């Protein structure tokens, strides 16, 4: 088949040794920066077609992070690739001990649809930096980006080492029978289990970035003007289709209405009175998810928005008040511009509420109180945490990104991408010279024991 | 069931917050220190009955490593557990950026039989240090240690947080239906796949230390007196039942008989003329494995040893020459005191040979040439490497231990154990103060 041949060619090219020298890896990463500059308008067009993105947010909410990762990894690659001496003991003082980094082999990256350039190419950058071959499986749901990357990736990168696999689930299922040395997947909890199961047949390690509802606890005594503007921004970018968007708010009933008003105000400033007319407001990805998201509004008390247009897959920025934790909107990842507010009486009820559910990819808290921030962190678990902002924590080079529990396993970005797509190999190199100190270890053992 | 109730009690205890303060974790580790000291003869006796270990090798080839791990982790725990600041950008000068370590929850350690104290308790030490509840499943193959641990663990440690699950394969399968937050398994490649498959049903991350044939390449023109004493030590300790034993030898045909003679010489020094009479020589764990290893000698040329005693599961230290790589002794992990020698005509052929096969847990080479060593490393892949010695590299606090590909995934020992059994959580803490610097990100975007 087309699929088996692509993997076969990718493994053969890795076995040929071409990816080992750093010079090669850098050329390929440089070919990706050239891809981003030369294909700028093609990239915008595809995101515009897929998700109603524009020239600005296509770059500054997605493409720029791929470029910054490339530039960063290029400059650090020689340091990261070098053998790493570690601490010696008196018994090993005359030896050399170090960690040797080496590629795993052929890496599979399975992309997703919501940021279809970032979540395909940024993982791929890491895997290329670590000297692996990389097979890419784009999500069909972002149809234009999928077809574009199939076309342009082979124009800039090595053809055998970095193939692109077309199709949907049946192709992905077939692809997953093939033998890989690492699999990174971004998507749903349920497919994450399927992918880990398939990985186990070849004992392949996995990086899984999965689902969850990222909570946003808003403190009673904080500046709600600043809080709600930041919350609104993170929640309603990409029409709410972000993995670390604040899914829902937890707040005291005393401040709920103020939050609604400040969310409304910020939303008006961002997108105007009618968000449908804004260039900067996105659209739901597909008919299936439009119907899914609209379904979550039903039966709820709507404070703002609450309508949608099926023909264009537009959903108005929507805020829900006094939301039942057991209702549909609070029982699945929203991934849409519907912001429910669940009421809690204290920090402690909010912590318990978060802990009774599955561990989220991101945890958010808005507060000026340092002890509230430390307490919430200390008593919960989540992939990453941001206090007094949203989104920005997953873009910083110094902060590895990933889930925990149902939100995922493994991590990447920056140095962690390089580690994730390498095997870190402990090495002990001794002199081959008689050492009396070692003779204590050889049989026969002493006939008389001594104290420890 | 009683397995479900144990796992429930361990999770309820974890969720209480009991394991979070470092003082609690250190008290549990100090209790483990007291256990090792107070139960020394009971441990030796169990290892003697299971594996034919003695007082000396019980401690100096197994128990001591657990003690050193405990002592090292107690001392380093505050530093490791502290929030770790990371590098800022000009865009993030007024923020706090740090990695926060926190327990995973309830960790499962599935032990194995060949080093049944080390490979059950040393992982448990790391998981305790990370603030997890730890459920323990010892291997039934080492029956005496299994029983001992079931009795003495609860006598010294928290009874809810750190339960011991008895039984064999059915009970392990039953245990694998329970939801854990991490599984560490040491054992076989085949069962490793079964573990990972069960873990996927709860999306549980795994540390798998599995099998392989750890190659031992012996260079021409190197000091074979020294090399062969070292190879023989690693190969034949614990009657060859070590994960990183030098499984087989690759050597130039011109030094095959020198290697044979040096191995003999060392074997006689270690274990005398009749190894069956040596207090320092072990026995095979079970009838099944005794027959399996004796079977591997069949069809092979015996340069030394080649006899066995079924009743006590003794197999003489055995050297095999001019071995066909397609023969059974070269198609499975040996895990016994049978050392085959496979001839190769060049360093390059040895690299191809190793690369052609599955990635081994360890790779060994013996050479006085630094370039040889570096080349073999650069062009192969294994879990770990030692040049000019065997075994020793998996005992060092500064060298993470673990496999790659068929020899496994993840790693532990030392600081890496703490990381493995914790979640490392990225934290950004910004001021809640109006910032004109951020305003460019908000819509409307400019033209
Ligand atoms: K390095
Ligand atoms: K000695
Ligand atoms: K032969
Ligand atoms: K603006």
UniProtKB/Swiss-Prot annotation, chain B:
PROSITE patterns the UniProt entry points to: ALDEHYDE_DEHYDR_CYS, ALDEHYDE_DEHYDR_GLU
Active site (record annotation): 209, 243
Annotated residues for binding of NAD(+): 187-192
UniProt lineage: Eukaryota, Metazoa, Chordata, Craniata, Vertebrata
Presence of keyword Electron transport: no
Family membership: Belongs to the aldehyde dehydrogenase family.
Cross-referenced Pfam families: Aldedh
Modification N6-acetyllysine occurs at: 177, 193
Function comment: ALDHs play a major role in the detoxification of alcohol-derived acetaldehyde. They are involved in the metabolism of corticosteroids, biogenic amines, neurotransmitters, and lipid peroxidation. Oxidizes medium and long chain aldehydes into non-toxic fatty acids. Preferentially oxidizes aromatic aldehyde substrates. Comprises about 50 percent of corneal epithelial soluble proteins. May play a role in preventing corneal damage caused by ultraviolet light.
Name the record gives this protein: Aldehyde dehydrogenase, dimeric NADP-preferring
Keyword list, A-Z: Acetylation, Cytoplasm, Lipid metabolism, NAD, NADP, Oxidoreductase
Any one Gene Ontology molecular-function term assigned to this protein's record: benzaldehyde dehydrogenase (NAD+) activity
Localization per record: Cytoplasm
Tissue-specificity statement: High levels in stomach, esophagus and lung; low level in the liver and kidney.
